[PDB]
Design a binder for this molecule. Structure first.
Ligand SMILES: [Ca+2]
Ligand SMILES: [Ca+2]
Ligand SMILES: [Ca+2]
Lengths: 80, 80
């Protein structure tokens, strides 16, 4: 089944909302949530629009796909 | 229901694979397919991996989310 994380040409990451935060911490070298999508909902306090973003642990996390209410895909880019 | 197209902060577009090609042509100012996902499958001749891309009509089209076999979200960026 679908890869949970993939690397783009520029080194940024496209990541499934279900990735556990523990695993996210490990792969970036960087509660009321235990997954990436959960962390997003916690931060925005609502279901974010695609294209909204926030910064966390020296990374920018941008919503890139929703499936209905599900935060399905995020883009992670290291802050410059 | 879900927006078919959204604009990112840098002006690039995140677009649903179901967007018809006619409508895509209009929004970019730019068969065996009539949708964006269809055009992708036609180009690759297989279901592409997330992060694969091609150039078409002065734009780069990058796969950014799959749902199983469905090409669910694409990133469109104007070639520099
Ligand atoms: Ca979607
Ligand atoms: Ca997906
Ligand atoms: Ca999806």
């Amino acid at each position: 089944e679908d890869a949970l994380m993939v690397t783009r040409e520029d080194g940024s990451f496209l990541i499934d909302g279900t990735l556990p935060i523990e695993e996210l911490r490990e792969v970036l070298g960087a509660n009321n949530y235990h997954t990436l999508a959960g962390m997003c909902i916690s931060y925005f306090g609502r279901i974010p629009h695609v294209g909204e973003y926030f910064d966390w642990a020296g990374w920018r996390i941008e919503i890139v796909d929703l499936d209905g209410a599900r935060i399905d895909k995020l883009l992670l880019q290291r802050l410059n």
